[PDB]
Structure 1
């Protein structure tokens, strides 16, 4: 495992999802918005504490180089499971254990991704490795944990 141009591109896409005003930096406001779209309601202090742990130039916001350094790191995310479980619950709004096409579309829209019907259907198809037309938690985990 080494840093690749394809991974850098992928991380830039993820950075853009946070940097919704496209000014090149992630603020506390932007980080909190995304966290809310994914099932959490961080306090003001935790948002600034989170940014502080990677704000190398001390300007109080995260630029792409800082974000990249954080995403490329050899870590082993000890908080991974919790985050992925909360995210699953946001997708699975009716709590039936399966993410439907409507459910996926809803969350993607709130993340700023106005997916076409074809994209929604493709996303479900990619994840639905058991072929029952919907995405269960184990299937969701595979999509979330891919590197």
Structure 2
């Protein structure tokens, strides 16, 4: 019926690169790898899934992974890696002294005055989830992962609204 695939988001070079790496881990040449190789082939390709991510991927699966499933796994993890990096860069934009912290006051301010402005209810929940009144934003990012300032603001608001949606259920 349909032709769409996550691999549509991959370049031809990536497909070839992922194919070479995958096959490098296929021992008996049956076109599949075992679940215990998944983490290592992903790392060999520059992706570092956490133990939880790996467990989630494996649960989606005779204990083997076929190539199209692997391409899908790669494409989805690459998307998450890119988003996570973008969220970190967006926070870094608002870290004026670059020390890895943002004041609760400053975070609340940029979230409500720039971009797709957070409501008082959204932002107050944000501050609650984020304080020692300093926000270690690296920790906040890891927690969410389970002008220049304008674009950065929207990155954070969309990331946070995504987190809120998941939490509402």
TM score, norm. by length of structure 2: 0.32
Moved more, 25-34 or 70-79: 25-34
Structure 2 residue runs of 5 or longer lacking an equivalent are 1-7, 146-169
Q: Residues 92-129 of structure 1, C-alpha deviation per residue, up to 9 Å, x if partnerless? A: 223232121222123213444555767544322212xx
Alignment match of 2:110 (pick from 107, 111, 127): 107
> 2 CA distance for matches of 1:45 and 1:88?
24
In our comparison, the structure showing a higher alpha carbon Rg is 2
Shift of residue 89 of structure 1? 0.7
Superposed displacement of residue 20, structure 1: 52
For normalisation by structure 1, the TM-score amounts to 0.35
* Root-mean-square deviation (Å): 15.1
- Contact 2:22/2:41, CA 8 A, preserved across alignment: no
Matched, 1:93 2:96: yes
**Structure 1 residues without counterparts, runs of 5 or longer:** none
Note the alpha carbon deviations across 1:30-88, whole angstroms, 9 max, x for none. 9999999999999999999999999xxxx999999999999997865242342122112
- Distance across 2 between alignment mates of 1:106 and 1:26: 49
One of 19, 30, 36 as aligned partner of 1:29: 36
Count of residue pairs brought into register by the alignment: 137
In the TM superposition, residue 4 of structure 1 has moved relative to its aligned partner by 30
C-alpha change, 1:26 and 1:79, in structure 2 (3 Å) is farther
Secondary structure of 1:26's counterpart equals strand
